[PDB]
Design a protein around this ligand. Structure first.
Ligand SMILES: NCCCC[C@H](N)C(=O)NS(=O)(=O)OC[C@H]1O[C@@H](n2cnc3c(N)ncnc32)[C@H](O)[C@@H]1O
Ligand SMILES: NCCCC[C@H](N)C(=O)NS(=O)(=O)OC[C@H]1O[C@@H](n2cnc3c(N)ncnc32)[C@H](O)[C@@H]1O
Lengths: 487, 486
């Protein structure tokens, strides 16, 4: 109970009162636990290297019952494990009673050890101490091997999740491996990474309620970025022809499984590229990244929870392209004539929505009805492959350049994986006269457009959702180390 | 005037009325201007390769036609330039009048060229067009180099600065190279990059905060002032070498080593102490400078490019100066502990008054000690970087107590020309000794109660390091879009 904490705390003072330092300043270890496993895993059973003295550190995770002369522990570090085998005959009795010194050790204690490497008779690789020193004590009782499935402890105290549940470490290692692979993928193709402001006087290139915060001395209100699209395109104007940013953005809406207040986005802008360049980019990149992580283009994913049978997602390129308006017009068996915000085709969409018992949009704007219609009739089209929804109407894509053969449409693409969007890209609108809100946009961006934005293609990736799919998670809370929670 | 803009706009609409697209969608180029220069730079003077046909794009930066059949242009991309030599005799009259088509071009227009490589008789590397298309017009007059030394246009329209001042490009390339070098340097050493949250409930981990309201939780959050706390929690969780490079926020005054957001890199290194962190700083700064410059000694105009430069040598080791001992030596006073006693407080206020230092208005001991070091120590060395070390425990509430000198901590701070670029220490890991767990929050404190190994942490100021390494004396010159008033 809380008695355990009280008792370990008082134990700590007792050691201080005997002039022992239960938190020493520095311990020079010679080798990591992984390095140890690598160098000594091929020893023979019962074999010892009793003249090779090592200093090693780790956390005690298992304490097995005292024999008269032998003590056994599990020691872990960097997500790996060796055994401690403390034998009375090898103990340097000059530095204290064997029994009392190893009786102090508790599960969760961090120790440093002076000893030699060797194996059990049974063959277990272990370090044989001569001396072990407490280095930092764990004052509470740690959960047991499978005792930590309570989500709240894993998110409000992720150090425990990282210590107990083997998988979580792999999940965040895989997250970093993905961001590394993305950085080096853009870097090898001549792209140039930059940092643009988190605070501005306007929210950027999407639609979302912002976070407001007050700069005091300047007595102004600033808004957290909802995207990076605008300053990065300005940098394209400045002749940084391949540019990207990997960092946080903020959107002040509701938490769910695919949506967190702050999330990690990566945007890139690519001068003289277009829609088709970006299609191939996405095919290239997801296929290579999956193959880089798994040795295959096929992975398995628990779309409907770990309680249910998973599905196979195949990242083999090319992926399918589905035209949003045409495909809605084909599934619904109706025809939507432009303008899409006609009174008549707005009412046609609203009748599709009422007839299929689909919820209707808070304001029934054409863009929001088309969005809802795609959400119900397309976005779960393919669940065994990523696919692209393409050629969105101009009324849904205020910064996408107009389609070069299909009037009213844009050269835009979104990629979906199990029906959740991971990717948003288009041929960038670069005619300042056609960006008709220059008469969530600001004059600095629009003015920059008048200096000549070359024909460019831009892409934005949801890093969190991609990580979810590649680490078999159903909630964004499992790929963010410190998800934000209600108290 | 603005008349130039109005006329360029009319020109655009007139091309559109004549069925010409002045913003085509896609131009498929064969080669970049850098690749062009690298590939044809050793052609002979006056030589041509008119049977190898290239597509290339760029920004037209010079438009000095001369002759009614020869037109000369400057073309830049990716920071490099070639000449465009448009000769009537190579023009494809089938795609439009030569003169008519080339009269349209203006300084700033982005264009695509179909042509062949060669050198002029003078030897100027050039693309020779058969066809030139407008891809995106520059509707404004571009300023020339002289025109852009106004600080405000460089900060308010950095695309201009990046187009006109080739200094600027180099600066920002250098900042990215610095961050690359740092990421690679940590990764090679076993370090694990993570992201920890930008908004927290606690004000921060190390100044006033930015407040903001989270709507879906009816809550107020604070932008992080440092990454120290969650990263130490990752050490508790067994990520024994961890780091983060991102923005932190400080709601304070704008001065040219101080911006509301700036880029920090903090790492935590389990089983390392103060000494490991000194050695790390020496290795990193020496190797980084050598990586960028092929030497350890750099020039830097501390007072601007108008005054004389000074030399900084980064060859290791750097000097270590112990703060209180040094203040005591210069002031010829003895500040004995506790440093917040009335007695020593008035010694320090007497020194401030006697030397006419401004007094820190909440005159705490920590503030005073800080003001004293800033006045007597912090610009001791300006020819070499140096460390101020062993700060009093009262200035360092998360630094582990000095293992031999009572009342001090195992902390270090590195200064270059008297501005601090990193702050590091042996970490305080005894929960009982962090005497607020009864700036900090309960989450961090409890996590200390689960066992923080002996650890050493370090924080770097990325912007300031870049300032010194790109010869700037203002932070706004190393930040692409510094915040200004409208
Ligand atoms: N120039 C073309 C588009 C540029 C990027 C543009 N700013 C944009 O599309 N942003 S976006 O639609 O928000 O897409 C960002 C991606 O990030 C992900 N995303 C978006 N909102 C969230 C939220 N709320 N949580 C998590 N992930 C999110 C998802 O993958 C999106 O496709
Ligand atoms: N456990 C060790 C401490 C970790 C780092 C500690 N959190 C810290 O010192 N944070 S910091 O004070 O913000 O310092 C980080 C560095 O950032 C730089 N810095 C600090 N404030 C600013 C401001 N405002 N602008 C620019 N650069 C700044 C300076 O180089 C500092 O040494």
């Amino acid at each position: 109970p809380r008695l355990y904490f009280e008792n370990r705390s008082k134990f700590i003072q007792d050691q201080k009162d005997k002039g022992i330092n239960p938190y020493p300043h520095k311990f020079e270890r010679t080798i990591s636990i992984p390095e140890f496993i690598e160098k000594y895993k091929d020893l023979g059973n019962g074999e010892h290297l009793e003249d090779t003295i090592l200093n090693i550190t780790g956390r005690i995770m298992r304490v097995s019952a005292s024999g008269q002369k032998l003590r056994f522990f599990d020691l872990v570090g960097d997500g790996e494990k060796i055994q401690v085998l403390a034998n009375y005959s090898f103990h340097n009795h000059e530095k204290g009673n064997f029994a009392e010194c190893y009786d102090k050790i508790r599960r969760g204690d961090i120790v440093g050890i002076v000893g030699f490497p060797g194996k059990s008779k049974k063959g277990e690789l272990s370090i044989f101490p001569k001396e072990t020193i407490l280095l930092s004590a764990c004052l509470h009782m740690l959960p047991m091997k499978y005792g930590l499935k309570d989500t709240e402890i894993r998110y409000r105290q992720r150090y425990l999740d990282l210590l107990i549940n083997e998988s979580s470490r792999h999940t965040f290692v895989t997250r970093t491996k993905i961001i590394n692979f993305l950085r080096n993928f853009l870097n090898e193709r001549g792209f140039f990474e930059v940092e643009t402001p988190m605070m501005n006087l306007i929210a950027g290139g999407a639609n979302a309620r912002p976070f407001i915060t007050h700069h005091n001395d300047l007595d102004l209100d600033l808004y957290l970025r909802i995207a990076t699209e605008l300053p990065l395109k300005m940098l394209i104007v400045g002749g940084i022809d391949k540019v990207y940013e990997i960092g946080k953005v903020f959107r002040n809406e509701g938490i769910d499984n695919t949506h967190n207040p702050e999330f990690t986005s990566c945007e890139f802008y690519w001068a003289y590229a277009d829609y088709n360049d970006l299609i191939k980019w996405s095919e290239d990149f997801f296929s290579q990244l999956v193959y880089h992580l798994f040795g295959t283009y096929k992975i398995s994913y628990n779309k409907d929870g770990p309680e249910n049978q998973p599905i196979e997602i195949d990242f083999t390129p090319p992926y399918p392209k589905v035209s949003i308006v045409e495909e809605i017009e084909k599934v619904t068996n109706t025809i939507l004539e432009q303008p899409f915000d006609s009174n008549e085709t707005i009412e046609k969409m609203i009748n599709i929505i009422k007839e299929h018992k689909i919820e209707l949009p808070n304001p029934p704007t054409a863009a929001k009805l088309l969005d809802q219609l795609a959400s119900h009739f397309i976005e779960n089209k393919y669940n065994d492959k990523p696919f692209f929804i393409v050629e969105h109407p101009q009324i849904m894509s205020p910064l996408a350049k107009y389609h070069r053969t299909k009037p009213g449409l844009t050269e835009r693409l979104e990629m979906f994986i199990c029906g959740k969007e991971v990717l948003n890209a288009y041929t960038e609108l670069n005619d300042p006269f056609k960006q008709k809100e220059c008469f969530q946009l600001d004059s600095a961006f629009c003015t920059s457009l008048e200096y000549g934005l070359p024909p460019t293609g831009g892409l934005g990736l949801g890093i969190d959702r991609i990580t979810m799919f590649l680490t078999n998670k159903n909630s964004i809370k499992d790929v963010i180390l410190f998800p934000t929670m209600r108290p």
